[PDB]
Every structure is written in structure tokens, then in C-alpha cells.
Design a protein around this nucleic acid. Structure first.
Length: 106
DNA sequence: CAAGGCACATGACAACGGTGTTCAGTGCCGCGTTGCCCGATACCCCCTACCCGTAGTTGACTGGCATCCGGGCGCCGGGTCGCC
């Protein structure tokens, strides 16, 4: 948690360095974007034991959230072909990213 | 009856027979190993597809988390604030 807080502080430093009153709005609304940017970047780059590239992180979390949405909607485990058409990629990519989306056991 | 004269064979005599050595010369032919000719190959090129890193995204949105008790048991050892 405090490590995330540190990273958000870095994102704030960036946003502050990249802010002025030329925008007719509060700093916080503008900042929330940079803060989430830095936090998501670090979560993609430093959270897992195995280092996963950013596009791979977004692929996995996108397929995960949409699969969860299918679980909530259908009330049943979506069949892999359904997931493949939903993500629009092939089942091969589905299994690839799924297996790439695990964590070690200590 | 004894001596002298003719047949057949006989002591050597070389020279062929046949074959065995030996010289001496030149090969014969055993294997070892060279010189070719091909097929494939690793190694340069070009092209685009896709992974991987970087940079933005403007209503507002200003302090979190769940801890933890039934060890148990004793000791050391230091700290810690009263004590007179």
C-alpha cells in the first residue's frame, strides 16, 4: 500500500510539473488521470513475480473483466469459443494469455 | 698234349637326360591412397507483422487497514518510573 502511495506521489510530481492555470479547472480533476496512469503503470510493471509487458497486462485484465461480466450475465462459465469471439481474438490467443496470466506458488 | 688264334664282355672312358638350383634381371601385382565430378547446405539479402516501450487522457472526486485476546512458560535483561 505505501509503495503504491509512493508511486502515486511520483505521478503527482509529474502532473504538478505538467499543470498550470491555463486550464479553467481544478488541479485535482486534471491530476487524477496522471495519478492513475502512474499507479497502473507500476502495477503492470512491478506487481507480478514474472514481468508482464503492458499490452499483455491490458489484454489479460480486459479478458478477465469481460469474462467476469459473462459470468455475471449468463450466470455460467462462458465456453472458450464465446470468450474468443467476445475478445475477437482466436481461442489460441485466449489459452495463450490465460496461461500467461498466473502467479507462482511459493 | 701245349701254344696260338678268334668271340662277348669288360675296366675304364664322356657325354647326354632330366631336372634342380641359381643367378640376375626384370617385372606383376597385390594391397594401401589421389584427383576429379555432383548434391545439398549455411548465410547474405530484401519484405511486413507484431511485440514492447512511451505518452497522453481535463466537471468534480483530499486519510486506510483489520487487527488481537484460552500458547505457556519461564527466564533474562533492560527499561522505567515510584520512593524516600
Amino acid at each position: 500500500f505505501l509503495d503504491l502511495i509512493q508511486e502515486g506521489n511520483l505521478g503527482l510530481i509529474r502532473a504538478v510539473e505538467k499543470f498550470d492555470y491555463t486550464k479553467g479547472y481544478k488541479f485535482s480533476t486534471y491530476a487524477t488521470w496522471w495519478i492513475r496512469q502512474a499507479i497502473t503503470r507500476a502495477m503492470a510493471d512491478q506487481a507480478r513475480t514474472i514481468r508482464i509487458p503492458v499490452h499483455m497486462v491490458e489484454v489479460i485484465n480486459k479478458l478477465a473483466r469481460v469474462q467476469r461480466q459473462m459470468l455475471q450475465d449468463l450466470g455460467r462459465e462462458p465456453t472458450p469459443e464465446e470468450l474468443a469471439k467476445e475478445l475477437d481474438m482466436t481461442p489460441e490467443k485466449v489459452i495463450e494469455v490465460q496461461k500467461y496470466g498466473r502467479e507462482p506458488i511459493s
